Amino acid sequence: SDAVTIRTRKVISNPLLARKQFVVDVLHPNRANVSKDELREKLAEVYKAEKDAVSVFGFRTQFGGGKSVGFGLVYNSVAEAKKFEPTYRLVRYGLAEKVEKASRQQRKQKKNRDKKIFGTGKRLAKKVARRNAD
Amino acid sequence: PRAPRTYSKTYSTPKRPYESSRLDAELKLAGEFGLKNKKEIYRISFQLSKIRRAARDLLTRDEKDPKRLFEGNALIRRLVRVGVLSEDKKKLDYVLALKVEDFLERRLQTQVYKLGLAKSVHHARVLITQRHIAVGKQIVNIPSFMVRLDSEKHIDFAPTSPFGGARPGRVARRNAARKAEASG
Amino acid sequence: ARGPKKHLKRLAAPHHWLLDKLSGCYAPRPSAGPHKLRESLPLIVFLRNRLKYALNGREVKAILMQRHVKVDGKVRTDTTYPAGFMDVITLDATNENFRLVYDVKGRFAVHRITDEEASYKLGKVKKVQLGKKGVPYVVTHDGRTIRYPDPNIKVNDTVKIDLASGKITDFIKFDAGKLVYVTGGRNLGRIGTIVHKERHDGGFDLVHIKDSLDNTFVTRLNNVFVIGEQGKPYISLPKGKGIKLSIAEERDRRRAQQ
Amino acid sequence: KNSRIAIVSADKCKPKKCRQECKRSCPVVKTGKLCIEVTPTSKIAFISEILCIGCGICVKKCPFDAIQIINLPTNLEAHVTHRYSANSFKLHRLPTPRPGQVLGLVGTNGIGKSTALKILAGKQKPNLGRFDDPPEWQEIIKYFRGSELQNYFTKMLEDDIKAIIKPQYVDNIPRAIKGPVQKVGELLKLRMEKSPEDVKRYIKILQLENVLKRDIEKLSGGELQRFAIGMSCVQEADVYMFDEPSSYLDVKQRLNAAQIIRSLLAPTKYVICVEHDLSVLDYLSDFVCIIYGVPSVYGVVTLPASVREGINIFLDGHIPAENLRFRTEALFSYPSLKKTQGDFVLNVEEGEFSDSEILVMMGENGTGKTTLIKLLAGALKPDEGQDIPKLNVSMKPQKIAPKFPGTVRQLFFKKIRGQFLNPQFQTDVVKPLRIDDIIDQEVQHLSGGELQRVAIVLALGIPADIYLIDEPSAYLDSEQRIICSKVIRRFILHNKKTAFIVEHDFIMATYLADKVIVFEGIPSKNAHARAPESLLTGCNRFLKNLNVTFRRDPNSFRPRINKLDSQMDKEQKSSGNYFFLD
RNA sequence: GAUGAUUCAUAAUAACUUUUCGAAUCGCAUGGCCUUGUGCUGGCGAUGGUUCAUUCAAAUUUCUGCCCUAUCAACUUUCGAUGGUAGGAUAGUGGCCUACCAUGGUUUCAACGGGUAACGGGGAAUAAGGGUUCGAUUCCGGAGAGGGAGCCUGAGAAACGGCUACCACAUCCAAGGAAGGCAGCAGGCGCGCAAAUUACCCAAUCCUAAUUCAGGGAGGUAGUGACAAUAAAUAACGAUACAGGGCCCAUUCGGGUCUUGUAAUUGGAAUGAGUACAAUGUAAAUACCUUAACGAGGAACAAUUGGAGGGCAAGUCUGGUG
RNA sequence: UAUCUGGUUGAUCCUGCCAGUAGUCAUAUGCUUGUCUCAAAGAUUAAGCCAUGCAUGUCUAAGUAUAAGCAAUUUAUACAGUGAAACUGCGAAUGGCUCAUUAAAUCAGUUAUCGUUUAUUUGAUAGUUCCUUUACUACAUGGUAUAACUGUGGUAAUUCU
Numbered sequence A: 001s002d003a004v005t006i007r008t009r010k011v012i013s014n015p016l017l018a019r020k021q022f023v024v025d026v027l028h029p030n031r032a033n034v035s036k037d038e039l040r041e042k043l044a045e046v047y048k049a050e051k052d053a054v055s056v057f058g059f060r061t062q063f064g065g066g067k068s069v070g071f072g073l074v075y076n077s078v079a080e081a082k083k084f085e086p087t088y089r090l091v092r093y094g095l096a097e098k099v100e101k102a103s104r105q106q107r108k109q110k111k112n113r114d115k116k117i118f119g120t121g122k123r124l125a126k127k128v129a130r131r132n133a134d
Numbered sequence B: 001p002r003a004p005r006t007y008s009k010t011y012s013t014p015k016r017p018y019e020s021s022r023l024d025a026e027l028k029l030a031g032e033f034g035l036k037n038k039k040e041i042y043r044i045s046f047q048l049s050k051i052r053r054a055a056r057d058l059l060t061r062d063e064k065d066p067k068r069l070f071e072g073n074a075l076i077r078r079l080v081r082v083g084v085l086s087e088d089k090k091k092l093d094y095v096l097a098l099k100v101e102d103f104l105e106r107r108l109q110t111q112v113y114k115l116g117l118a119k120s121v122h123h124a125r126v127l128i129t130q131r132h133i134a135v136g137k138q139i140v141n142i143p144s145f146m147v148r149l150d151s152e153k154h155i156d157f158a159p160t161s162p163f164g165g166a167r168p169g170r171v172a173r174r175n176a177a178r179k180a181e182a183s184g
Numbered sequence C: 001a002r003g004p005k006k007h008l009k010r011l012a013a014p015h016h017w018l019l020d021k022l023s024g025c026y027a028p029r030p031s032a033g034p035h036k037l038r039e040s041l042p043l044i045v046f047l048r049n050r051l052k053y054a055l056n057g058r059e060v061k062a063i064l065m066q067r068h069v070k071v072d073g074k075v076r077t078d079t080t081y082p083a084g085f086m087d088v089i090t091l092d093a094t095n096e097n098f099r100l101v102y103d104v105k106g107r108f109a110v111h112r113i114t115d116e117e118a119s120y121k122l123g124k125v126k127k128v129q130l131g132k133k134g135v136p137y138v139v140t141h142d143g144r145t146i147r148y149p150d151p152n153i154k155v156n157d158t159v160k161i162d163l164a165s166g167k168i169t170d171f172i173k174f175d176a177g178k179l180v181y182v183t184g185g186r187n188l189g190r191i192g193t194i195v196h197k198e199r200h201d202g203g204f205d206l207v208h209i210k211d212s213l214d215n216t217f218v219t220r221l222n223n224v225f226v227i228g229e230q231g232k233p234y235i236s237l238p239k240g241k242g243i244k245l246s247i248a249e250e251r252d253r254r255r256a257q258q
Numbered sequence D: 001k002n003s004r005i006a007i008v009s010a011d012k013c014k015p016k017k018c019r020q021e022c023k024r025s026c027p028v029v030k031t032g033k034l035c036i037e038v039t040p041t042s043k044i045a046f047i048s049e050i051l052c053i054g055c056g057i058c059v060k061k062c063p064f065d066a067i068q069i070i071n072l073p074t075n076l077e078a079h080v081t082h083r084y085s086a087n088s089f090k091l092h093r094l095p096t097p098r099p100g101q102v103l104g105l106v107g108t109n110g111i112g113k114s115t116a117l118k119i120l121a122g123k124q125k126p127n128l129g130r131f132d133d134p135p136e137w138q139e140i141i142k143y144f145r146g147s148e149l150q151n152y153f154t155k156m157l158e159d160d161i162k163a164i165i166k167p168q169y170v171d172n173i174p175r176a177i178k179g180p181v182q183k184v185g186e187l188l189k190l191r192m193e194k195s196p197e198d199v200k201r202y203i204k205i206l207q208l209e210n211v212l213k214r215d216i217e218k219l220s221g222g223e224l225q226r227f228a229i230g231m232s233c234v235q236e237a238d239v240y241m242f243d244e245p246s247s248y249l250d251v252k253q254r255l256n257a258a259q260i261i262r263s264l265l266a267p268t269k270y271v272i273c274v275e276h277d278l279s280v281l282d283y284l285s286d287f288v289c290i291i292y293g294v295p296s297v298y299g300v301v302t303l304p305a306s307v308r309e310g311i312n313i314f315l316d317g318h319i320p321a322e323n324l325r326f327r328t329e330a331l332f333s334y335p336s337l338k339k340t341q342g343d344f345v346l347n348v349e350e351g352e353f354s355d356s357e358i359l360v361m362m363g364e365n366g367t368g369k370t371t372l373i374k375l376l377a378g379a380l381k382p383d384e385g386q387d388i389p390k391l392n393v394s395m396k397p398q399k400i401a402p403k404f405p406g407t408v409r410q411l412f413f414k415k416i417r418g419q420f421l422n423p424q425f426q427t428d429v430v431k432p433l434r435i436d437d438i439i440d441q442e443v444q445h446l447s448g449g450e451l452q453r454v455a456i457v458l459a460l461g462i463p464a465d466i467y468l469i470d471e472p473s474a475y476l477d478s479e480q481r482i483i484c485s486k487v488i489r490r491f492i493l494h495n496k497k498t499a500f501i502v503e504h505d506f507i508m509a510t511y512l513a514d515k516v517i518v519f520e521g522i523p524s525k526n527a528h529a530r531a532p533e534s535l536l537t538g539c540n541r542f543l544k545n546l547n548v549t550f551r552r553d554p555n556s557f558r559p560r561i562n563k564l565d566s567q568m569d570k571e572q573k574s575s576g577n578y579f580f581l582d
Numbered sequence E: 001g002a003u004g005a006u007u008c009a010u011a012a013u014a015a016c017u018u019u020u021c022g023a024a025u026c027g028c029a030u031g032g033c034c035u036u037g038u039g040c041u042g043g044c045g046a047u048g049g050u051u052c053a054u055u056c057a058a059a060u061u062u063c064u065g066c067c068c069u070a071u072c073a074a075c076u077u078u079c080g081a082u083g084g085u086a087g088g089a090u091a092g093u094g095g096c097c098u099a100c101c102a103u104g105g106u107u108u109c110a111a112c113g114g115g116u117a118a119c120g121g122g123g124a125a126u127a128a129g130g131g132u133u134c135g136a137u138u139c140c141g142g143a144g145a146g147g148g149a150g151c152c153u154g155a156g157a158a159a160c161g162g163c164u165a166c167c168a169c170a171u172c173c174a175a176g177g178a179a180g181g182c183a184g185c186a187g188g189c190g191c192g193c194a195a196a197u198u199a200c201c202c203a204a205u206c207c208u209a210a211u212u213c214a215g216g217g218a219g220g221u222a223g224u225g226a227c228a229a230u231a232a233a234u235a236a237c238g239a240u241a242c243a244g245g246g247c248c249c250a251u252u253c254g255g256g257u258c259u260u261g262u263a264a265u266u267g268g269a270a271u272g273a274g275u276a277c278a279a280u281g282u283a284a285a286u287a288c289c290u291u292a293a294c295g296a297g298g299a300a301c302a303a304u305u306g307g308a309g310g311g312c313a314a315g316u317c318u319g320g321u322g
Numbered sequence F: 001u002a003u004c005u006g007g008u009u010g011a012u013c014c015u016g017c018c019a020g021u022a023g024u025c026a027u028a029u030g031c032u033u034g035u036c037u038c039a040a041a042g043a044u045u046a047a048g049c050c051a052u053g054c055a056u057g058u059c060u061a062a063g064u065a066u067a068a069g070c071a072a073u074u075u076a077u078a079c080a081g082u083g084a085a086a087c088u089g090c091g092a093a094u095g096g097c098u099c100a101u102u103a104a105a106u107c108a109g110u111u112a113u114c115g116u117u118u119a120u121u122u123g124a125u126a127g128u129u130c131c132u133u134u135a136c137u138a139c140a141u142g143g144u145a146u147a148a149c150u151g152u153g154g155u156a157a158u159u160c161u
């Protein structure tokens, strides 16, 4: 860690989405990048809100190093952050948990399989459970 | 579908392939400026042809004409800004008299050589390409960079390199490793 | 074929929205509303591309569903609701009030207005007739129908509409010496006083118009919107005041402030 | 890159009117060769299979669409999945597992159907045709990019998939036990891995009731197979393989064997199996995958099909999806009168075992068919004498067991060389069978399927008094069954001997039946044998004893089972006629 | 009252109707005033509904403009061809159709026929100026869903991931019967000189729906990809041996400074291609950008493709054939 | 970026063609192939034929819920939370693909509807119906079904019923 000197820029307060949105410019000489979590900690001490109310993304590192430029959001509370931030960024921060899902094809196969049945399907099921005798 | 990406071609080969005068001219240019193929010279003659075509289209227009004034001042301004066109010669007739050595003196390769950080155009080429050069505070490794004549004061070695300091490099650190190995 | 279209490709969208040609195949097709889809501005492109209050259409929908924005005093939680010329847009968080007026480059401007001015709008009457049971009405340029109007109001006049009620406060007639706004065509965005109008029975009445720097031009009567008498307008004009500096004067003015 | 040949259709080729434009056009005919032989009087144009380069010029130059280009199997040197070794068997494609569904593999034995399942299970990681330097999983997955198999193989590395195979070799599994010795049940008990009550009770379905208490080694091949299925079914696994489940099973068990495998199916689960019997596959598989290629040289997996279309393609031998023809179109007194152990009374009943005219002898699984054949060979005597020693037996065990370091051709010297006359004698019978290939190979690492074929030839050799072929249906493909039945038939006319064949199949039985020893009786509890009843009568009795009815296919005469309650099935019980072509 | 203009908007009268519509609907909040009954009264919505206007559209329509061909000079007209009058049908205008009537309508200024390896346009390539050739294909319009024809539902379809029949293919079958339509996305056969993965995802762009939430092979993402297009490595620098100018010298063939290039002469520096912690990237990854650790120097990390009579750069060669 | 050159003769000057020369969001093919960005891609021949899977569905405080579904109560013995099925309502006429047909046809620019249909959106807009009009009655609110469900079944088989 060598003097990352995080500077927020182009700041604008958005009360419609209950946040502040800004471009973050970080100078990190003698160092590869700066990680998003350490960015969030430093921005959390700059705007004094919490860590779980700040969000960063963007972050292309400049050619030749020494600089990366990204986008930040601090929120008005972590409640408002959990109601407006996208879920992929919440599970990236560890605020939500990645719901385990079947794959997209398997869901589509199951939906087309249920398209062929009319109603609950209990009568067809009991008919095959009877005709297991014959 | 999405909007197509525009692209254009940036050079043009000459009409007669084998003519001894033009061959000896382009080899003199390539040797004096440290170029790798004839495509670079064709690129500059294409750019100069486009500039001359715009200036030819404006000089047919009469003077005091609003298009001629606007685009002549803009073209003259871009040429005096990149340093291809001198400060006194600013009259759109000197624009026509330009030639490819005026453009070739402004590349980062020959500027690094003229500032004297290089000792050759070929050393300048490899110094640029191997990232020991920084025109602002930003590394440039493109030899055809066309410095803009207030950037000439700021061409210097990169901070994150040897020759600008703070860590030697792979083969130096290896040789130091061998000599510290022999000491212990 | 076979019915109405529901999509709108990018590169087919109106050019004054200033949507960049990359980042997507589609543009937000304006839904049916008070304005024609070419001379309109959807709330998604106003909230995202002009005010930068959102980064996604998903965020524009998130803004809209908590009933923050309202347009002409009604809430309008629709993503592609066509906001058009002279519409007021109220953002109660930040207590902001915009009016959609053109800048002289021909694009919709971010014209912040005060809270007293957000209480009204102007409308150009498009037809006056008698409805059922002999009740007269006018139809303004954004399709509002107003019953029992003043008998002096003929077509191509401007009526001041109250926007809490739908009532008419006052009205500006159409003759020489009237301040106009050009909404349509090549001269879109310019403000000038009308000098005279050309009869042309059979189609496309022309009107001659000169701005404050005494530059004349002419426009069809379809694209002219009277906004008051010379001197005072009935609304606040945006920055520039519809002057149309040439490109020579424009880079001279840019080299002043640079 | 497949070899292309022009076939001419008998329909819509009319040489009298055609002006023989196919013949004039042909380049190979121009070079001199008689690639197409056709004259105006001729019935049909003939195109030589080996003198056609498959250019396709003839197809364009015909007044009628009588000519058509098809492909032929060939070595491809491309898209290889696996080579065992240098100059070894090559597996080109890999079947794609389908979720929720049964996917059947059909082909000649030795084509790589078993190789596919091991690869899918993870047992045999593919080398993509690099035996010398096998690629690691990182490289295999990148080969599979653009396919469902990439995601499927990635999951296996992450232990997201559990895949179990049911071995095709019944014989190997008794040798290897959890312990030194154990009975059947305690093997099941520890690896039940499923509550007995809540899931459907496979043990009741798989007819394992009595045999929970026997030691594993005593079990015959017939019982053992239903035990092998039971070990796979008790497992909780994401993917389920079943190699050759039909083997050593009678008709009622095979339908139940079809029933058990499908019951495993779930949306998450995968079920893929290689079954040879066509008739069971109707009730076994949603989808059918044909494998083809010269045996033990190369094998190519094809696109799947639905069963009804899939099976009909296999019988036809011409896949239409890929325009190739893979060319497999299917078309005296001895009154022993008792034997006991005290537990399973196989009371025999009198027979006039006929002269020189082949007989089936057909039972059920626990019905103790082998005891009679053990008793015709002198062994397993009756307690209270009345044992006739007259007959001399060339039998062949059901559990054939290798004990010697023998190359085949030397085993040809050791017992069966005999006189080896060229006409109608052991030289003639061998020619259809592919035993000419296997002479070099060692019998110990001769394949199980091929080991059956060597035993069949081995047993037929010594005439003795009576060869008794025991159960020759196992470990043979469909085509090999047709060849084997005829090769038995042609031989057994020439010798004035008889044979009691111990089939658990039915269709080969019906082809190789003149008189039928029936075996009515409870299985795996005291039976009762009967007399060698005549053909129409004897199938029907056994068919009565199971409530199974068979229908004669109109086009191809293939015997297909009926549904348990259906119009034909009801009609044939009422008419009394459970079978046809008597 | 309007329009350039109306038998227009609108109003009135007399009837008509087989009689259209004129709320038996849903959610939150739950007040106000009383002779106190479960009294009267009342907010913000949601859905529906007649008519007009508006918007998204549609259907017709005016003017002008299309490649080659006269080895196409006359074409249309009982079966509508051109017009007239009435009707019918249509959402409406009209030979759109019918009844009666008249004999018209197009054409060398190229009608009518034939051909097109012809969807039209924005546009593309190449051009000093003028042109010539192309446009299946990112946008706009049209048409089609194997070929034809017919129709249901609906605001909107002559709909094909709707139905009906015929014609052509073609599947299953227990022979009774049943089900079909990739010029969607992948993929296969065939054809050929000729063109990619039966992968991941709704994160973005937007669309649909009762709807912020669900869905989307639309669309995005990676794979394949020398179709074109941009930038741009394959070496840079010394020290010493080898082939050169006046001059310090005014010391005849002596150092040669000041350079220019060869070297079976030696030195360190420099760096990416590559590999890889990590972080960034991303829906999750891969890659790019950044970066520890490793990664160079002559048999290593080794650039080809065509040529050397002329046109047209480059042999006053050496073997082979004859 | 307004350029030519080789070949008819014993030599010459011409006519004149052939040949070279440069380009191609023109294709194909051969040889070769390190890096970054960007990118077309079964049009031509066959609008030839298709195994397999997917590509059109949809829920709000706000149409209908006694799932013999899941939850926890404590407002509420009529219901009231979440929520399958099914009915109702919308959507499936947009999108995507291709270029066979088509030569005053399509199309382009420019007009017209005073010659018409228009779901939706947005703005307006409906004291008149006790149809024989003193009750012939329900307007503090009228009648049937029918699905899902439950149960009995047929067919080899279908998104059959």
Ligand SMILES: Nc1ncnc2c1ncn2[C@@H]1O[C@H](COP(=O)(O)OP(=O)(O)O)[C@@H](O)[C@H]1O
Residues within 6 Å of the ligand: D084, D085, D088, D089, D107, D108, D109, D110, D111, D112, D113, D114, D115, D295, D296, D447
């Ligand atoms: N483990 C093995 N090692 C080497 N060769 C084998 C092996 N297994 C089979 N082979 C050879 O390659 C072929 C693979 O087919 P196989 O595994 O027997 O399946 P199938 O039962 O379809 O023949 C066999 O015919 C055999 O000759």
Ligand code: SF4
Residues within 6 Å of the ligand: D008, D012, D013, D014, D015, D017, D018, D019, D020, D021, D022, D023, D038, D044, D045, D061, D062, D063, D064, D066, D067
């Ligand atoms: S298609 Fe064959 S059979 Fe028929 S006319 Fe031609 S050559 Fe003879």
Ligand code: SF4
Residues within 6 Å of the ligand: D005, D006, D025, D026, D027, D028, D029, D035, D036, D047, D051, D052, D053, D054, D055, D056, D057, D058, D059
């Ligand atoms: S495919 Fe060619 S070689 Fe073969 S028969 Fe036809 S024309 Fe002859």
Ligand SMILES: [Mg+2]
Residues within 6 Å of the ligand: C028, C029, C030, C031, C080
């Ligand atoms: Mg929209």
Ligand SMILES: [Mg+2]
Residues within 6 Å of the ligand: D113, D114, D115, D168, D243
């Ligand atoms: Mg096997």
Ligand SMILES: [Mg+2]
Residues within 6 Å of the ligand: none
């Ligand atoms: Mg008429």
Ligand SMILES: [Mg+2]
Residues within 6 Å of the ligand: none
């Ligand atoms: Mg008429």
Ligand SMILES: [Mg+2]
Residues within 6 Å of the ligand: E118
């Ligand atoms: Mg065509």
Ligand SMILES: [Mg+2]
Residues within 6 Å of the ligand: E136
């Ligand atoms: Mg075509």
Ligand SMILES: [Mg+2]
Residues within 6 Å of the ligand: none
């Ligand atoms: Mg199109």
Ligand SMILES: [Mg+2]
Residues within 6 Å of the ligand: C001
């Ligand atoms: Mg259509």
Ligand SMILES: [Mg+2]
Residues within 6 Å of the ligand: E146
């Ligand atoms: Mg087709």
Ligand SMILES: [Mg+2]
Residues within 6 Å of the ligand: E160
């Ligand atoms: Mg149709």
Ligand SMILES: [Mg+2]
Residues within 6 Å of the ligand: E161, E182
């Ligand atoms: Mg389709």
Ligand SMILES: [Mg+2]
Residues within 6 Å of the ligand: E182
């Ligand atoms: Mg396809």
Ligand SMILES: [Mg+2]
Residues within 6 Å of the ligand: none
């Ligand atoms: Mg060469």
